[PDB]
Amino acid sequence: MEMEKEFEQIDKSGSWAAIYQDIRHEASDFPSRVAKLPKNKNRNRYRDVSPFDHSRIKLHQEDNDYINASLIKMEEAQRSYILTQGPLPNTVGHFWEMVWEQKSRGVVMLNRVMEKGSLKCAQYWPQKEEKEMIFEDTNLKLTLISEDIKSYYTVRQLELENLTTQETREILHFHYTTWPDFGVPESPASFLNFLFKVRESGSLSPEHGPVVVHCSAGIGRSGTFCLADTCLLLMDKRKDPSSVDIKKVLLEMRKFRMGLIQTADQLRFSYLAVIEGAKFIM
Numbered sequence: 370m371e372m373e374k375e376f377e378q379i380d381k382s383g384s385w386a387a388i389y390q391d392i393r394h395e396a397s398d399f400p401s402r403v404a405k406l407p408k409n410k411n412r413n414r415y416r417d418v419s420p421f422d423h424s425r426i427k428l429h430q431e432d433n434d435y436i437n438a439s440l441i442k443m444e445e446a447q448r449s450y451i452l453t454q455g456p457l458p459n460t461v462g463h464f465w466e467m468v469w470e471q472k473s474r475g476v477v478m479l480n481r482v483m484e485k486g487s488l489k490c491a492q493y494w495p496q497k498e499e500k501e502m503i504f505e506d507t508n509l510k511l512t513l514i515s516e517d518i519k520s521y522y523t524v525r526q527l528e529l530e531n532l533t534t535q536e537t538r539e540i541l542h543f544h545y546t547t548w549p550d551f552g553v554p555e556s557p558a559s560f561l562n563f564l565f566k567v568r569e570s571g572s573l574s575p576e577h578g579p580v581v582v583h584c585s586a587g588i589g590r591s592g593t594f595c596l597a598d599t600c601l602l603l604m605d606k607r608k609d610p611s612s613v614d615i616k617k618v619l620l621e622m623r624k625f626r627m628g629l630i631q632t633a634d635q636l637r638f639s640y641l642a643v644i645e646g647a648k649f650i651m
């Protein structure tokens with residue numbers, strides 16, 4: 370079926386939970402043996418969210434190459450994304466090592482450091498120009514260059530230096546700051562505006578490594594971001610845009626990381642975002 374009318378048909382019939390459970394039943398199951406090794410327990414935020422072995426990002430280190438991060442490679446859309454958990458106190462150095470090694474331009478952050486009164490990720494970037502951060506375990510230096518605070522999101526320019534080689538690179542930090550503590554946003558307008566700002570920066574384009582995107586677990590809000598982006602790109606590429614099937618795209622993405630889209634409300638919100646976004650594109 371088309372999207373917008375499939376949408377109204379699920380609303381009127383109140384069957385979002387049944388649609389979402391079908392997706393959960395059909396989703397791929399692949400091994401994640403490296404994630405479950407005992408030496409990696411303090412590298413995982415949640416025991417039930419792990420990268421598959423076949424798609425995990427490897428750190429360029431011979432001691433321990435593990436990080437909780439997955440490469441989502443979308444062949445028809447010609448887009449790639451790295452989805453990862455919010456960094457932990459003992460993985461902030463690994464996080465920036467990955468950004469460096471994978472040649473990423475942008476980092477997309479969809480959570481606040483504290484939500485619901487608890488810590489959802491480490492304070493992994495510097496908050497003042499004159500107070501830079503040094504990650505001694507991976508030999509990197511990170512400096513805040515500039516910050517632009519808007520009503521729904523903040524954009525930061527960061528300098529990452531590889532202290533071994535003295536090479537430097539500019540990284541863009543796109544921080545969506547207004548996702549509610551509970552539920553999903555009422556309108557997708559500010560989320561779509563944010564997505565377009567990331568696109569306009571070059572961070573999603575083939576001349577760079579894959580964008581790094583995270584929330585707390587790296588599957589819920591993060592899944593919504595890459596699902597909406599890929600669906601909108603396919604609608605631009607194809608002769609028949611109504612042929613884009615959001616449930617099929619989501620199942621393809623779940624071949625590369627488990628659990629993408631965590632609730633039926635996130636599924637409905639993804640439909641809403643793609644539907645509204647397709648009208649603005651034209």
Ligand SMILES: COC[C@H]1N(S(C)(=O)=O)[C@H]2CC[C@]1(O)CC2
Pocket residue numbers: 379380383384385386387633634637
């Ligand atoms: C559109 O429905 C939203 C509700 N459904 S429903 C009524 O479709 O089954 C699920 C359970 C509670 C919700 O508010 C979110 C998902």
